[model samples]
Target: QCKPNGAKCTEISIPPCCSNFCLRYAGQKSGTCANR
Candidate 1:
């Protein structure tokens, strides 16, 4: 997400790894957020 694309979802208050983790998580989905 932000980290890989060059954005900072953190800095202000967001977690350091949140954006990157979100990106990884988004990739894990089969079709939706829960594989639905």
Candidate 2:
């Protein structure tokens, strides 16, 4: 999702799940700063 201001319903700092989720979103689905 795109906003004039940056914010997410959830946040994460680690890898794998966060990384993969973002990657998958960027590729196949809507990009989300998705949390596990």
Candidate 3:
């Protein structure tokens, strides 16, 4: 959840039989990216 403006983002869906989910993209070089 980098938050560059994806409609203020509140999207979360997992364990629904696992369709692959790892949505978190941050680029600045530090501890800011999570979800894996």
Candidate 4:
């Protein structure tokens, strides 16, 4: 399950990001996949 960039993700999600990492702000339980 490859999540595309900008896709929603969570700390417990597996393979959260497709080609990048999950970007989450402070105090957030979910986030979006992004590239640094």
Top-TM-score candidate index? 4
The ten-residue window of minimal lDDT in model 4 covers 9-18
Native-referenced Cα lDDT, model 4:
0.65
Each candidate's lDDT (Cα)?
Answer: 0.28, 0.32, 0.28, 0.65
* Model 3 per-residue lDDT tens digits across residues 1-29: 33222222123421221323334234322
Q: Which candidate is the best by lDDT?
A: 4
For candidate 2, what is the lDDT?
0.32
TM-score of every model versus the real structure: 0.16, 0.19, 0.16, 0.45
Each candidate's number of clashing pairs is: 0, 0, 0, 0
Off by over 4 Å in 2: 1-20, 23-29
Candidate 4 lands at a TM-score of 0.45
Q: Candidate 2 deviates by what RMSD?
A: 10.2
Error of 2 at 19 (Å): 7.2
Task: Quote model 3's TM-score.
Answer: 0.16
Expressed as tens digits, the lDDT of each residue in 1-36 for candidate 2 is 222222232233222342324423323433434433
